[PDB]
């Protein structure tokens, strides 16, 4: 009946989804083969006798991650023909992933989610995963998002884009791949959450006290906030909040739907020794400005909407006390046209940690999704990088050879500036 | 199966457990082959572990404490730098408190009879003797190679010497302390030991 | 009897003949130093590790047959294959190579068998191919 489907594009979204569904596989007790030795229906289908099968498509025009997952230990978990892979990469071109080498693979994805969606009736939304700094992560995921919008207009398209860091780059066309895609992603998705690199990179610096993890270690840190966001759907709770109520509560005006993320506590064996982890300081550390997943410092920010999802043995008799100390706190400012901005949820299931990983188990946890107006600084550094490229017509010589003609860069420029200028009347 | 299948401990583990399950089935409905949880193994034999003054102890003394394998040898200078800090980590956690929280079992790559004793005399915790076949079956089992000499069964070496790991009850890898891994932090990974979780039961 | 041998370092343990209950048994024919089987013997190890040892129940099991021209050559390839084999002095090796119509370039082959011993499914590697074997086919009573 009510079920959710995930779409991953780009090798960043593939590696994020790999940590997502090792951890959901740990969470529901299913095997990497697929057999349990009725909450599993919301992510899996009972395909025959005892097999629980994940609902996904894995898109990447660059095939070396798709066939490497196929070679990997999770080969019977995933159905081999949603792991459709292109012959060659879009090569960090928003042009190539959207016109030439996007067409022969987008029809293989759309006829696929057709048979995956109608497994049930009364479906809720999409967990879209993409990297915006790349070519087939941006181009193919936005190509997909347009066709999903014109086919299923009654869904909650929930996209988690990995926004590029200011200083950490790993690319140089990422000013172009992000600005030119925000035009065609703003009016097509419904809920978006920023995930900058270096913000979560500092989170595992000071909280986890590892100098130097790998990419997969932070994808496990991401998989925690993927988990408890949808753990209300999976497991029953004292006060459950689902995907379909995000439009009612978390988004004030339909244009502004770019929120943040936070998880607390993100700790290890050193930290679990010496602290009680009670709701009072857990929501304080969740609202600590350096635990934000996008370098969004809200000291010059201006909050409007907020949703916290606790899990574990958490009682609402101190949840109300926890949010009361936040409202009385002066360092956190909310906006004058909402009397309250907090919605709290509680799930009975405590989180599970990956064995051999870097999180120790915690009886209590929280994921935090807030809409603030300090999203402007996330896109104003992206403003500065784009026009310094575009001052002397930089890098567009192959964009125009593919189908990015002159003009859509400039109208994407005034719509990013329309997104900047959208942030201050809603702040005033 | 954990951590690998192509290990000399696991090949005798399922051989003895399937022989036990089928002599029970022949004596007496059971499903073949049995599960991993139904597969129970006595990991350490009788005359294998010993302490200072060299008295043998059975495996049953290791209950209620966190047991850590220590793959090391005296010739490696990384082992020379790590050893005094592992002495001080085995120090502080173990007087501090009311219970014997941690315990280390040592396995050696020393190049004859004599070189094992020199590293032994500077070491207070438990160790097994290089003569018995237990040392090299553990050497393959947790996938440690100083250099590729014994042919591997398709598994590249995750960890090199020195390597300290923590184990569970049934010979199960808990987490690699990454003194030498695909990560390589030196002399700091010792405090990653989580002694509520790693239990020998 | 003492014809099929489970690997063990220090001494080779003879596997008890009703080990194969409930699993799909696939004969793997190969010859050491042969160029085509050089890239097939690792990827058939890949299916051995991933498929069988993902769940608690064992689903596949592979018997090794050698066409090798030297006893020491057989020993150093048997020590590389993580599945069980047959001894070089055994009756069964030249019984099976004569039965299953595999001559001494067509090599390697995989032949899944049944409990009655007769042929159940053949596929070659002469050229995703090896995936076509399903472990639920030859469930043994």
């Amino acid at each position: 009946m009510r079920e959710v489907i995930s779409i991953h594009v780009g090798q960043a979204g593939i590696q994020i989804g790999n940590a997502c569904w090792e951890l959901f596989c740990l969470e529901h007790g299913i095997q990497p083969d697929g057999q349990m030795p009725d909450a599993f229906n919301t992510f899996f289908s009972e395909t025959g006798a005892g097999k629980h099968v994940p609902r996904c498509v894995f898109l990447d025009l660059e095939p070396t991650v798709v066939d490497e997952v196929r070679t990997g230990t999770y080969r019977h978990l995933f159905h081999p023909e949603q792991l459709i892979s292109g012959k060659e990469d879009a090569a960090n071109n928003f042009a190539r992933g959207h016109y030439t080498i996007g067409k022969e693979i987008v029809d293989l994805s759309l006829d696929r989610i057709r048979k995956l969606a109608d497994n049930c009736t009364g479906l809720q939304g999409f967990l879209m995963f993409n990297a915006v700094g790349g070519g087939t992560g941006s181009g193919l995921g936005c190509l997909l998002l347009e066709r999903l919008s014109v086919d299923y207009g009654k869904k909650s398209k929930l996209n988690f884009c990995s926004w590029p860091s200011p200083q950490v780059s790993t690319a140089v066309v990422e000013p172009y791949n992000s600005v030119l895609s925000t035009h065609s992603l703003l009016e097509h998705t419904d809920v978006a959450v920023m995930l900058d690199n270096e913000a979560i990179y500092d989170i595992c610096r000071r909280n986890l006290d590892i100098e130097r993890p790998t990419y997969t270690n932070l994808n496990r840190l991401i998989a925690q906030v993927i988990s408890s966001l949808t753990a209300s759907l999976r497991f029953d709770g004292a006060l459950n909040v689902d995907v379909t109520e995000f439009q009612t509560n978390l988004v004030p005006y339909p244009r502004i739907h770019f929120m943040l993320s936070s998880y607390a506590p993100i700790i290890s064996a050193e930290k679990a020794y010496h602290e009680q982890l009670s709701v009072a300081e857990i929501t304080n550390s969740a609202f600590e400005p350096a635990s934000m997943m996008a370098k969004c410092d809200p000291r010059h920010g201006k909050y409007m909407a907020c949703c916290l999802m606790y899990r574990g043995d958490v009682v609402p008799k101190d949840v109300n006390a926890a949010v009361a100390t936040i409202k009385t706190k002066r360092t956190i400012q909310f906006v004058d046209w909402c009397p309250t901005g907090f919605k709290c949820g509680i799930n009975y299931q405590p989180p599970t940690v990956v064995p051999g990983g870097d999180l120790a188990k915690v009886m209590r946890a929280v994921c935090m999704i807030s809409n603030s107006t300090a999203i402007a600084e996330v896109f104003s550094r992206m403003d500065h990088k784009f026009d310094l490229m575009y001052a002397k017509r930089a890098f567009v010589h192959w964009y125009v050879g593919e189908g990015m003609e002159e003009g859509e860069f400039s109208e994407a420029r005034e719509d990013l500036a329309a997104l900047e200028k959208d942030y201050e009347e809603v702040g005033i | 199966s954990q951590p690998v299948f192509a290990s000399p401990l696991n090949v005798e583990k399922r051989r003895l457990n399937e022989e036990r399950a089928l002599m029970q089935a022949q004596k007496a409905n059971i499903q073949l082959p049995p599960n991993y949880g139904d597969m129970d193994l006595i990991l350490f034999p009788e005359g294998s572990l010993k302490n200072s003054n060299n008295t043998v102890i059975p495996q049953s003394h290791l209950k209620g404490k966190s047991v850590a394998l220590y793959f090391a040898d005296g010739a490696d200078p990384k082992c020379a730098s790590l050893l005094p800090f592992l002495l001080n980590y085995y120090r502080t956690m173990n007087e501090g408190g009311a219970n014997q929280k941690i315990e280390i079992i040592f396995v050696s790559l020393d190049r004859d009879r004599e070189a094992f004793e020199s590293h032994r005399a500077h070491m207070p915790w438990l160790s097994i003797d290089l003569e018995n076949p237990l040392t090299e079956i553990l050497k393959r089992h947790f996938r440690v190679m100083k250099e590729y000499e014994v042919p591997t069964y398709g598994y590249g070496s995750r960890t090199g010497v020195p390597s300290v790991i923590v184990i569970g009850s049934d010979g199960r890898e808990a987490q690699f302390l990454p003194i030498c891994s695909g990560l390589e932090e030196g002399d700091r990974a010792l405090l990653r030991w989580d002694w509520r979780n790693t239990k020998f039961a | 009897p003492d014809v099929v041998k489970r690997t063990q370092q220090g001494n080779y343990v003879p596997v008890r003949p009703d080990h194969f209950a409930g699993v799909s048994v696939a004969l793997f024919f190969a010859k050491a130093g042969h160029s085509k089987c050089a890239q097939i013997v690792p990827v058939v190890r890949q299916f051995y590790k991933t498929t069988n040892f993902s769940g608690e129940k064992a689903v596949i099991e592979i018997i090794y047959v050698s066409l090798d021209k030297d006893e020491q050559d057989f020993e150093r390839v048997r020590a590389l294959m993580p599945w069980c084999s047959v001894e070089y002095k055994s009756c069964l090796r030249k019984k099976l190579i004569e039965r299953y119509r595999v001559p001494n370039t067509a090599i390697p082959l995989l032949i899944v068998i049944g409990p009655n011993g007769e042929e159940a499914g053949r596929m070659n590697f002469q050229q995703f191919v090896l995936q076509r074997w399903d472990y639920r086919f030859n469930k043994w009573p």
């Binding site: 740990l26 007790g29 230990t73 990956v354 064995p355 | - | 040892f53």
Partner: peptide
């Protein structure tokens, strides 16, 4: 890699 299952503790 292959990872365990957390124990389903009975009637918590």
């Amino acid at each position: 890699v292959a990872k365990p299952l957390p124990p389903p503790v009975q009637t918590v």
